[PDB]
Amino acid sequence: RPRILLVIDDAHTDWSKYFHGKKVNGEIEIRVEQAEFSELNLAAYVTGGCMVDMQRSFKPDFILVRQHAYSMALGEDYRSLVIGLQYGGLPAVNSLYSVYNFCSKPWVFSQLIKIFHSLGPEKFPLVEQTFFPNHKPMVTAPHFPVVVKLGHAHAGMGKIKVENQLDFQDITSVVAMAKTYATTEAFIDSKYDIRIQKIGSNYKAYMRTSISGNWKANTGSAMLEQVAMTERYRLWVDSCSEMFGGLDICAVKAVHSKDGRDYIIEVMDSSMPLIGEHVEEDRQLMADLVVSKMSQLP
Amino acid sequence: RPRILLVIDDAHTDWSKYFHGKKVNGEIEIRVEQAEFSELNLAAYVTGGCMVDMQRSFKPDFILVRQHAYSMALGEDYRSLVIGLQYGGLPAVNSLYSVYNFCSKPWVFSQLIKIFHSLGPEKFPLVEQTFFPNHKPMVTAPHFPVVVKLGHAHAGMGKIKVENQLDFQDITSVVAMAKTYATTEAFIDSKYDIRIQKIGSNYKAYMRTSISGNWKANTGSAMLEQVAMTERYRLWVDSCSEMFGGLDICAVKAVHSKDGRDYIIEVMDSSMPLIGEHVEEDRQLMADLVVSKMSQLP
Amino acid sequence: RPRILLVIDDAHTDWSKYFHGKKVNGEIEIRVEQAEFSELNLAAYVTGGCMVDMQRSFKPDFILVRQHAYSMALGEDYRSLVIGLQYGGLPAVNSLYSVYNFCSKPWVFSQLIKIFHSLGPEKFPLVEQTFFPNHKPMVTAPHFPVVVKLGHAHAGMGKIKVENQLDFQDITSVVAMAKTYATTEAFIDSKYDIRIQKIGSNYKAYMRTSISGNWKANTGSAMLEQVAMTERYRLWVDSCSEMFGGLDICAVKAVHSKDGRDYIIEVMDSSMPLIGEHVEEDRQLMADLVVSKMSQLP
Amino acid sequence: RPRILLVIDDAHTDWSKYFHGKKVNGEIEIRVEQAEFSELNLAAYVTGGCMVDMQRSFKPDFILVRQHAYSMALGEDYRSLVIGLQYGGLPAVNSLYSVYNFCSKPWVFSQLIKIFHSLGPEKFPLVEQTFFPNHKPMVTAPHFPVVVKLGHAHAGMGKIKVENQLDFQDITSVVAMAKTYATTEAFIDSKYDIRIQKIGSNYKAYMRTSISGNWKANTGSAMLEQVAMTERYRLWVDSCSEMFGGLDICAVKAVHSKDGRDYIIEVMDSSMPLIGEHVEEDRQLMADLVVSKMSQLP
Ligand SMILES: Nc1ncnc2c1ncn2[C@@H]1O[C@H](COP(=O)(O)OP(=O)(O)NP(=O)(O)O)[C@@H](O)[C@H]1O
Ligand SMILES: Nc1ncnc2c1ncn2[C@@H]1O[C@H](COP(=O)(O)OP(=O)(O)NP(=O)(O)O)[C@@H](O)[C@H]1O
Ligand SMILES: Nc1ncnc2c1ncn2[C@@H]1O[C@H](COP(=O)(O)OP(=O)(O)NP(=O)(O)O)[C@@H](O)[C@H]1O
Ligand SMILES: Nc1ncnc2c1ncn2[C@@H]1O[C@H](COP(=O)(O)OP(=O)(O)NP(=O)(O)O)[C@@H](O)[C@H]1O
Ligand SMILES: [Cl-]
Numbered sequence A, B, C, D: 001r002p003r004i005l006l007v008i009d010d011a012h013t014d015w016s017k018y019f020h021g022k023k024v025n026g027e028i029e030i031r032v033e034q035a036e037f038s039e040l041n042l043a044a045y046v047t048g049g050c051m052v053d054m055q056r057s058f059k060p061d062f063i064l065v066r067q068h069a070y071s072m073a074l075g076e077d078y079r080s081l082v083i084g085l086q087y088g089g090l091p092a093v094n095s096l097y098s099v100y101n102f103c104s105k106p107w108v109f110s111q112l113i114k115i116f117h118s119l120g121p122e123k124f125p126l127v128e129q130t131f132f133p134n135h136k137p138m139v140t141a142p143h144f145p146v147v148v149k150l151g152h153a154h155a156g157m158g159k160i161k162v163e164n165q166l167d168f169q170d171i172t173s174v175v176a177m178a179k180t181y182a183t184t185e186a187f188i189d190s191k192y193d194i195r196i197q198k199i200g201s202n203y204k205a206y207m208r209t210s211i212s213g214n215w216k217a218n219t220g221s222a223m224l225e226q227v228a229m230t231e232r233y234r235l236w237v238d239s240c241s242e243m244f245g246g247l248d249i250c251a252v253k254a255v256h257s258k259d260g261r262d263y264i265i266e267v268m269d270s271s272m273p274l275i276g277e278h279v280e281e282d283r284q285l286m287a288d289l290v291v292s293k294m295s296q297l298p
């Protein structure tokens, strides 16, 4: 019988095309199921595995997670589906263990702080961010302008450049109303984003400039240019890939000031956006990695 | 047996002092219990009435509601207590029917819009506000600076003066995190707030200026001066007092531009803040009002 | 220009077919837009009206509300869209005012209690229900078995027959976890549901028996039989139609014990399910009513 | 300067008494602060550490977590405080990494399933539970009576013994209102609970029987008897103690059927209840453990 791969993704792409001809241990056919989280439900059993309902029912053998499991500004919460697939004992890329731990940005950021403490600010320039568990301790910032980031949200949501204290005070009331946590960090007058990605043993670096006048350079029209990988960029991404027992797919993003300094602001996992000119190549590297992992199982 | 009045209030006042010596129809004594919403629970019955627990247990005959039942920035939600008291058939000031309908600012604002459509902008100069059910349709505003007011909140919370379109975009992105509705309206360069109140048949008008540099004139230190009532002001509040079957206590607030134009921005009910130099007279007027209502009961 | 009717509905039906040939004041063409709540967004303006986006944009002139605006067990909350359409000043069936007040079952039930108090248990046999604002006051019930109903939910959701005190205690912990209110009432050993509906001046009565062995007789396969209207049934539905300024469409449901007694358990508004053999006739009566209301406008 | 230990606990005990006279490396004094989660707030910084406010303000050096950080039936959620302390780089017992991962019972259960897959049912007799991400896939169970356990809750809350399929259907309908996940497993006709605990290198086994007629043997009055540790029990707890990078304090609980079979039902961490006649010795062992950990710091 074919091994069933479930690709969980919201991207407008047909994942089966990247698996054409690929067989587990060069022997067993791979059936590719594809759905976004909102289309999936399951029961999971101590005795072993998951029965998945896609709206059709099936027991998956392997998961590829391409979609964010938690997106607070969209009102989407699939963390319990992640719990279920892990309860079923499913092997996955990235590991369901890491995917679950990635469902809170400040929790992930706490791992970046460990890297920072170990490597130092010259090797790993992490942005000097502050974390507030709720609105109450938020009074001011040491440096304006400041970037305030609410909760666990993506694609620029929940994020504001605050210019002054009066404005900061009014934003803290929004943190209160949202009943969530928040972080603050210096706004960097940045020329472009830098993102270093790792897919298995493939590395790429890109610079990204907003061509729509956006300080959130990952929103709206952007110009993307692939740049040379350096050993400095490689240490960033390799260091990040070590967390939560290991990340098969990940990326680290920095902002690059007009003064020449980089500041690491974020890390991403197997649900990272695919950017630049090699998106089709990147999905094929992901499919290659998945088949290799499937073949390493009994 | 004394008739039991339950005053629900968060203010630091002994309400019993305004009722001492007051009897229902000059005959029956009034027992005043007082608590804030957070200290109260109840069961309500089709067969009639409520049993209230106060942390003492008792069956109230009449309710005075002085505290806001819903405050999103405080994370306080006592709407189900208001449902309960109405379910029990309790008479109150204001009516529990009106109190419940007051737990959504834009719901109440829709009633102001009905008055505005009827009386026109000369007699009832309602601010030209826009309502958004969520963040999605918020793109821009016709005129900057703009005041954005998020959800249902009090005492200046979730109210933000936005200077320009770029800043507006970031505000829209954090509004999303509150998962609630929002309103926009033009910022008025205002000399002072005007508030017209009604307590039964007693009318007062106050002007209020921040003496602590706040565009939110109802926050921080202010100077308050009582001003003469006019026919113009009397129509504003009288009109407002007809909503939701009739409001015994209410107030209408306007801002007054440097160029001499008034803009109505808010209506308030029996939980309105008491302001200026006649706070104790106002509480006494409220007690006299409750007693006249209590005297209509069997 | 055509008058735009927005029918908000989740039913698999094409509403335009019921409006074919119908013209406002026999003169103006009616453009029928149809969507479910999840497909709609809007901005609403003090200056007048709403701009609606359906996923196409338009200003509606009249609303028909066929869909529940709030369904807690489905995680669907459209109350802010109701607020918006009312803020826009939209005329509707039923009134947006009543539709909003219908978005809480115990709040509606409090109106049934007023009818009960006025008419008496012989003319209006309301079930003797208790309301709890939260889990805390819930200890036991006076009669087992009891029906416990959590929050504001439809189609049988949030509802359980509890046989004993130990079971009741464990259900109260579910009320706590759901952070909602609940009601309790005697379980009636019922032969069938009785539902009396009023669409304008059209009345129908049905009896409904579960043929799938369900105490929730409105879930699963049922046998429906139309029965004769009586003056007793007419008083029930006419009395209910008076609430929240008037209900153009409504229904009242009772359960009928094996001992011969009826117990009114619920009232429904313009989003009531359509049942029995005359669903197509009922939608046409609704369309007739809508056009008549549209014609009574300027 | 004394090293500051923050004990987070809701228990009515003076933790300072177990540390009096204990010095970090026999040299530096320990200052013990104690509070429950509800009394604490903080800011955490990339540059290092947390400032904690206790309602006093201070920077802790080490944390002991004795209180549950997440209790859905109590409406208590302190997960963002746990994030904060980890963000600050705080060492703790148990590790803040493990504490956070323990805030979802089924997430933790998935780790028990890994141990079960490895050791088998003879050595590690895990109850054959099913996990449901939400109410939708809950239709029936293979064996009645069944224990349904809703969400993430403690002290018997949301745990319901369901006797049959008809009752199960109603439970499913109220589970939906909690908007969370749920688990089902066979009810064991149990003589007593067995709990095996580990505190550092100290092991105890207790049997516990309800003396107040409760299938939930950890609720109400019980009799507790310490029993001999065995290799069998030692493997259960040792296995469990390896999860999430290592647990310094943990316990495994089983139920023991009338026919003599054990079924493992739960694992607990540093917030485990202290039980039986050695509660004070157990707290002292915990203090000795914290001191040995604190002695490893600079
Ligand atoms: N401190 C900062 N200074 C300057 N620019 C910043 C800063 N933080 C974020 N940005 C910019 O804003 C963009 C979005 O912020 P980011 O923190 O990456 O959130 P996000 O869009 O939610 N990320 P994601 O989860 O991948 O969708 C970044 O790509 C930068 O271009
Ligand atoms: N459009 C506006 N232009 C200028 N000032 C405004 C405007 N809207 C509000 N204000 C000012 O800000 C204050 C607070 O706004 P308001 O809408 O009254 O919120 P609030 O404080 O939540 N009211 P409340 O519920 O009584 O506590 C008002 O008293 C005015 O002084
Ligand atoms: N007290 C009761 N005794 C016996 N049967 C009852 C009782 N209450 C409800 N039922 C039955 O359960 C069904 C569903 O309960 P109901 O209170 O009508 O909730 P609902 O299904 O959410 N209604 P709706 O909002 O129209 O979808 C009723 O139609 C009756 O058949
Ligand atoms: N499947 C089962 N069969 C028989 N008894 C059970 C079963 N599951 C739980 N119990 C009993 O019910 C008690 C409570 O269940 P448990 O799963 O421990 O929930 P809890 O009280 O929330 N645990 P905790 O987090 O330590 O407070 C257990 O101590 C057992 O005595
Ligand atoms: Cl998001």
Ligand SMILES: [Cl-]
Residues within 6 Å of the ligand: B070, B071, B072, B073, B074, B075, B152, B153, B154, B155, B157
């Ligand atoms: Cl508030």
Ligand SMILES: [Cl-]
Residues within 6 Å of the ligand: C070, C071, C072, C073, C074, C152, C153, C154, C155, C157
């Ligand atoms: Cl529902």
Ligand SMILES: [Cl-]
Residues within 6 Å of the ligand: D070, D071, D072, D073, D074, D075, D152, D153, D154, D155, D157
């Ligand atoms: Cl709990």
